[PDB]
């Protein structure tokens, strides 16, 4: 049939499974090479491996590679789904396995693909039931016993190889474990090229930029990105085209394409599947929103982007990048705002954490959560981890009286060994924010964990002008007013307090607008906030931070600065 | 057939779901368009998404929407529930899943709805059972595999998506996670109209006010409310007539008054006049509260989100909770009253979970006003604690800070604080953006307390004249709570006098002036002068 002709040509292959060549090379070796040239193996006098375990995070290409091998190799293929074999009748799962292996051996020199063995082969010492123990023992004796495996090779796929019987992880049963892992930039580019081979893309789309901007996508998310971009484009073109009660007009199908805007929208919308648990609600901030603190903004941009944008120079200079920063100062100065701006206008992934957000009452579960979040961050690198209000989760362990249950000390030790310990040195930048540095563990503020401690001060005159202009960028204003007097009058306020003044100006303008609007309906009077509203909104203006906390923050600042002396 | 005609009419479909147009748009885009015009998809060269995970609170209309789209489309519908498919023996739950998918793919192009999926996918890590792991693996293999499925769509329903195996929320299994949230005022109006398409109303019936006063009732709640109100009407207008073993001309006069719906909302799951004095505080709070909600268009035009927090501090029994309740009644926003020491816990890391839960509920049920009563108990001075309880207090105050002002979407949530000792609070909550306004509630003057007495006597049977000015001027040191106690004592004295007078007979319908005098003869003062001096000093230093 016509559908069969295209479907037959639609069979996957080696060209379709691009993104990881080394693992592909190993699988190709084992599956084909002893079948193409057995004479060289008998010449060298050894038999090849005949067992594989493909493992990795979900959606990387394991089942796809198995399908590709099935389509390419001319040998007989036998697929076994995981929970397909066992039934209620005692002694039937083993009968099914025996029948499967018997068919494979009797038919031809074949391949057996067993999908999701983590369910069929758990650790015997841990399981309490009996049928699973019997079936795993059956699989062991069937795969490696006496007079077994006459030219048969087994392939396995799993998302969690650790939960496998150790007796299965040895030579003869599963010879070597192929790691089908997260692709790199070139791998993502290759995946994009593969998925955009049959699509009618526009002439203005380049895939290099997309591959560069997408970071932690596992390759199953690239298909999602392509599908979502196609969906946006078709939605846009259908809002124009008629309801199309009949068959779609031939005039629109001849002119179809997907522009860079669709892909960009999908990229801004999509998120890697691994981090879908830790997604952050869409909050919009931009660098133009953060007034003042220009040096800090520039330095943060550099320290977050240079390891990402320019890794070639780093590797040519032969040194690592810096992966830490701490913000400390009076409250409301803009630390959280800087974090939001980073999360919005930085390409690397973002992980947001509240203060106690990961603390549980169970034993060791807080440390389990810490390990989980850092493992996610390391897997989906480059990544930015924001630890808001650090002093809640990381205090001076053992100082004064420790935790009664001794849990704070354990969690801070786990945090220590996750930020600096035996690891693979991935791109994970830790952003810290606190307003009480004296209660922080000295072992966290060391270089290599939190390198540079940036102090955000109260805004000066120019910073006040900058923040006022940033806050009033989108409001409608008359040309008459000038904010320099507003900035000068304060002399001690913070960005939060200036926001409060602007808010009261807005409320007074709102009151006047409603008061002037009601008479129009009873029987656009103030399209902008006038100088009177600002003049009258400061009547209830009071300083936010007192004179006792400010002196403490400053004194800590000079205490830190003094140790830098003698230079 | 008589029932056959109702079968077609009762067939759920479009216009039955109200308040989820965007989500309905996405779902119908996924379900109908590829089945309506597949030639364009074959031309563009990309398979459609074929998996959805609808989530949200229970009883919102997830099953309704799935059934509606399925019945509208020509696809076969098969429903699978959580507990029904899982068993105790070994090796049949996966068989059930396999048979379901097999017959669905064998019969016709079908739409499958797995209701309550969170009971089948426990994440394979926080779970010890073996059958659950095996069924999760079977579900994964059925959804994706060597020629797994074709021309079939799957939808799931859950309340806690986080408690699902991440391998299920991958492209090809669950493509787009649609949020079926609580509906707004417009959604509530349209669902009321939808549910009232067949019932007969009265002339003086409006649904906008009903949508206004109803806050958290969603979907099935609305259906149950309407059904039981109609049933009560039917039962009420059947006993007052003779129980005939009946003329349609008299039966077709049923209607539905408003009082029926009033008590319907009163039994199913104060006012501005009740507060005396505090006029400037009342009007300031009123503007700050209902200006965002009554005029959102102009705020969008100006581009500035409003302030949220307020803090009252002063003597107890003054009416902070009274103002909070008045707000809860005077705006449709939900009210969440939480006491100070209520959130604490001897366990480790549980007060934090409590705070996360209450704030998540407040943000989910927006607009909302959250009343933190006795905030001094939680938000202790973060520095001078020096103890393990001090560490716990530091933890909880940090959680409060990061929750009320943190990486959030800025939903409409208003935090109201109330304390009688404002100088034991960390000055991080008091910064603008968390709790900007510092309102001081003083002891009421003579006119204020007279108005308080008048408001308290709003519905109390009273003589034509009581001369409240004397009692008002003779209680210079009292508070609103104390005045309420005096009024209650007078009422109980009148009640017992009437009971004693009528006992001999078996007398005054209104509280007499003599009764009021002998009730005022006993009184107590709950506030000293030192507390007033402390509050005055705090206000002066502020």
């Amino acid at each position: 049939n016509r559908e069969d002709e295209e479907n037959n040509m639609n069979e996957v292959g080696y060209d379709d499974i691009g993104g990881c060549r080394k693992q592909m090379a190993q699988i190709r070796e084992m599956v084909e090479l002893p079948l193409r040239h057995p004479q060289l193996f008998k010449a060298i006098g050894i038999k090849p491996p005949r067992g594989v375990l493909m493992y990795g995070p979900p959606g990387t290409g394991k089942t796809l590679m198995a399908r590709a091998v099935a389509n390419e190799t001319g040998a007989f293929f036998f697929l076994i789904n995981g929970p397909e074999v066992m039934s209620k009748m005692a002694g039937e799962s083993e009968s099914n396995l025996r029948k499967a292996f018997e068919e494979a051996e009797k038919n031809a020199p074949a391949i057996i693909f067993i999908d999701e063995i983590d369910s069929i082969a758990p650790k015997r010492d841990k399981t309490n039931g009996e049928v699973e123990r019997r079936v795993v023992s059956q699989l062991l004796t069937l795969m490696d016993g006496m007079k077994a495996r006459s030219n048969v090779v087994v392939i396995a796929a799993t998302n969690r190889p650790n939960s496998i019987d150790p007796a299965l992880r040895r030579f003869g049963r599963f010879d070597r474990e192929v790691d089908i892992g997260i692709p790199d930039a070139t791998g993502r580019l290759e995946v994009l090229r593969i998925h955009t081979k049959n699509m009618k893309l526009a002439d203005d789309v380049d895939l290099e930029a997309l591959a560069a901007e997408t970071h932690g996508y596992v390759g199953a998310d690239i298909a999602s990105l392509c599908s979502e971009a196609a969906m946006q484009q078709i939605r846009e073109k259908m809002d124009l085209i008629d309801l199309d009660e009949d068959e779609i007009d031939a005039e629109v199908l001849d002119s179809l394409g997907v522009t860079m805007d669709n892909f960009r929208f999908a990229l801004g919308n999509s998120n890697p599947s691994a981090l879908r648990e830790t997604v952050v609600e869409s909050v919009n901030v931009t660098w133009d929103d953060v007034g003042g603190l220009d040096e800090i903004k520039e330095e943060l941009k550099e320290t977050v982007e240079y390891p990402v944008l320019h890794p070639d120079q780093y590797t040519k200079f032969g040194l690592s990048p810096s992966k830490g920063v701490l913000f400390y100062g009076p409250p409301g100065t803009g630390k959280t705002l800087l974090a939001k701006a980073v999360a919005t206008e930085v390409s690397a992934n973002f992980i947001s954490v509240k203060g106690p957000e990961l603390l549980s009452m169970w034993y060791g579960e807080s440390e389990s959560n810490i390990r989980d979040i850092f493992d996610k961050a390391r897997a989906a690198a480059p990544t930015v981890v924001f630890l808001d209000e650090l002093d809640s989760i990381a205090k001076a362990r053992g100082g004064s009286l420790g935790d009664a249950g001794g849990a704070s000390d354990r969690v801070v030790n786990q945090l220590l060994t996750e930020m600096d310990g035996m690891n693979a040195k991935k791109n994970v930048f830790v952003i810290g924010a606190t307003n009480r540095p004296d209660q922080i563990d000295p072992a966290i503020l060391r270089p290599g964990r939190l390198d540079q401690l940036i102090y955000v001060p109260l805004p000066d005159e120019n910073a006040r002008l900058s923040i006022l202009n940033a806050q009033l960028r989108k409001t409608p204003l008359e040309p008459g007013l000038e904010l320099t007097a507003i900035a000068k009058a304060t002399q001690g306020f913070s960005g939060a307090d200036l926001l409060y003044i602007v808010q009261r100006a807005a409320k007074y303008a709102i009151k006047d607008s409603i008061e002037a609007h009601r008479q129009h309906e009873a029987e656009d009077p103030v399209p902008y906030i006038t100088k009177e509203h600002f003049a009258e909104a400061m009547k209830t203006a009071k300083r936010s931070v007192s004179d006792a906390e400010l002196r403490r923050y400053e004194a800590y600042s000079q205490q830190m600065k003094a140790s830098r002396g003698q230079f | 057939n008589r029932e056959d005609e109702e079968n077609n009419m009762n067939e759920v479909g479009y216009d039955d779901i109200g308040g989820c147009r965007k989500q309905m748009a996405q779902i119908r885009e996924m379900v109908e368009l590829p089945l309506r015009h597949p030639q364009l998809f074959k031309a563009i060269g990309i398979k459609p998404p074929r998996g959805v995970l609808m989530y949200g609170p229970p009883g919102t209309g997830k099953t309704l929407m799935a059934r509606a789209v399925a019945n509208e489309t020509g696809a076969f519908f098969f429903l699978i529930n959580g507990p029904e498919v899982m068993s105790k023996m070994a090796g049949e739950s996966e068989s059930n899943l396999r048979k379901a998918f097999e017959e669905a793919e064998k019969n016709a192009p079908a739409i499958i709805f797995i209701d309550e999926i969170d009971s089948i996918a426990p994440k394979r890590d926080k779970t010890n059972g073996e059958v659950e792991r095996r069924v999760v693996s079977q579900l994964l293999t059925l959804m994706d595999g060597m020629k797994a499925r074709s021309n079939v769509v799957v939808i799931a329903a859950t309340n806690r998506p986080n408690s699902i195996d991440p391998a299920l929320r991958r492209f090809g299994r669950f493509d787009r996670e649609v949020d079926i949230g609580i509906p707004d005022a417009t959604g509530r109006l349209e669902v009321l109209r939808i549910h009232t398409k067949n019932m007969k109303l009265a002339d003086d019936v409006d649904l906008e006010a009903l949508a206004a006063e109803t806050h958290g009732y969603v979907g099935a709640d609305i259906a149950s409310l309407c059904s039981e109100a109609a049933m009560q009407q039917i039962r009420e207008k059947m006993d007052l007539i003779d129980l005939d073993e009946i003329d349609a001309e008299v039966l077709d006069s049923l209607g539905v008054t408003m009082d029926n719906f009033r008590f319907a909302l009163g039994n199913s799951n104060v006012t501005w006049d009740d507060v005396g004095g505090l006029d400037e505080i009342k009007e300031e709070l009123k503007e700050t509260v209902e200006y965002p909600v009554l005029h959102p268009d102009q705020y969008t035009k100006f581009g500035l989100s409003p302030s949220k927090g307020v803090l009252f501090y002063g003597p107890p029994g003054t009416g902070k909770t009274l103002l909070a309740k008045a707000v809860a009644t005077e705006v449709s926003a939900n009210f969440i009253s939480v006491k100070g020491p209520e959130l604490l816990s001897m366990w480790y890391g549980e007060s934090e979970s409590n705070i996360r839960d209450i704030f998540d509920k407040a943000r989910a049920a927006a607009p909302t006003v959250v009343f933190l009563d006795e905030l001094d108990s939680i938000a202790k001075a973060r520095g001078g604690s020096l103890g393990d309880a001090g560490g716990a207090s530091d933890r909880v105050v940090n959680q409060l800070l990061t929750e009320m002002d943190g990486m959030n979407a800025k939903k409409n949530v208003f935090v109201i604080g109330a304390t009688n000792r404002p100088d034991q609070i960390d000055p991080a909550i008091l910064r603008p953006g968390r709790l900007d306004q510092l309102i001081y509630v003083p002891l009421p003057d003579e006119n204020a307390r007279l108005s308080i007495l008048n408001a308290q006597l709003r519905k109390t049977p009273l003589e034509p004249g009581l001369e409240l000015t004397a009692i008002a001027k003779a209680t210079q040191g009292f508070s609103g709570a104390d005045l309420l106690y005096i009024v209650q004592r007078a009422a109980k004295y009148a009640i017992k006098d009437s009971i004693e007078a009528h006992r001999q007979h078996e007398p005054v319908p209104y509280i007499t002036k003599e009764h009021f005098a002998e009730a005022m003869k006993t009184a107590k003062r709950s506030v000293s002068d030192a507390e007033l001096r402390r509050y005055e000093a705090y206000s002066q230093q502020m």
């Binding site: 009748m89 005692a90 049928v131 034993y363 009664a404 249950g405 | 105790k88 023996m89 816990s345 716990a392």
Partner: peptide
């Protein structure tokens, strides 16, 4: 006229531990 058998599993209770804060 033929019999048969069947093996089925059973649930088992599991203990736990929990840290506790204190004053």
């Amino acid at each position: 006229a033929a019999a048969a058998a069947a093996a089925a599993a059973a649930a088992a209770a599991v203990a736990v531990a929990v840290a506790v804060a204190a004053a």
